[PDB]
Amino acid sequence: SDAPPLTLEAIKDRVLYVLKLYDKIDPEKLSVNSHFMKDLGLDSLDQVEIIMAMEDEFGFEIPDIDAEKLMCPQEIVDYIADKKDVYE
Amino acid sequence: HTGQEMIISNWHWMTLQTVELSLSFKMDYFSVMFIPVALFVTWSIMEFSMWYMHS
């Protein structure tokens, strides 16, 4: 396997890396506590697009009932860490 | 080299009236040719699996 034990700050770096390349939002204004619907003015379809982007980049897929209620990068990181059982 | 051919019936299992069942091995061309090929393939596969399923 040789899979490195991915950690929370690594996960947060990956989320910020994926988001900063989404040109619809400005990287300077984004924050790890920033919202999507209000603080960035993103559409629901756009939110689905980021959810699928994380799906593709992390190699695991999020169920719809859990994906539609993620609106901040911090809770995305929390969900991924809970799914993959990360300590620190 | 020669074309040696042989069948070995070592252990006589049981006799049912006029039928005799014994542990008989046939070592014909097919067997003597397929033993090394299968053993070589199994050796390579085992060496590969020593790495594939270390976890």
Binding site: - | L16, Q17, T18, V19
Partner: protein, 128 residues
């Protein structure tokens, strides 16, 4: 337009193509609410019985006992002799027996006759 999907017994209609949830009325919403309510009640009871540290046994499930009783021990008392049941029983319990008996009887008569007339070539047939 596109070719229609015709559902069958072994290929049922998909949920998305089904039209029941596209005709939406308040009573349908009430029915869904009641279904969710009873499901949540059962789930809450199960979880209450599930996380108890004092419990050291198997959670008896009334549905499983009911299913087993219905499958095994409740068939005869609800059985009635009707033309459909009687006909199906007679067929499925008598027809195969007589069919196989006829087949084997004809085969053995043919073999036995060939034995009498002598064109069977039973050479080397020692074990029997």
């Amino acid at each position: 337009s596109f070719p229609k999907y015709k559902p069958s017994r072994l290929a049922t209609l998909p949920a998305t193509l089904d039209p029941a949830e596209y005709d939406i009325s308040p009573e349908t919403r009430k029915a869904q609410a009641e279904r969710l309510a009873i499901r949540s009640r059962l789930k809450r009871e199960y979880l209450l019985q599930y996380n108890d540290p004092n419990r050291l046994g198997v959670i008896e499930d009334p549905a499983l006992i009911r299913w087993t009783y219905a499958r095994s021990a409740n068939i005869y008392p609800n059985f009635r002799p009707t033309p459909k049941t009687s006909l199906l029983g007679a067929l499925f319990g008598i027809g195969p027996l007589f069919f196989w008996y006829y087949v084997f009887k004809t085969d053995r008569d043919k073999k036995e006759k060939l034995i009498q007339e002598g064109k069977l070539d039973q050479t080397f047939n020692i074990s029997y």
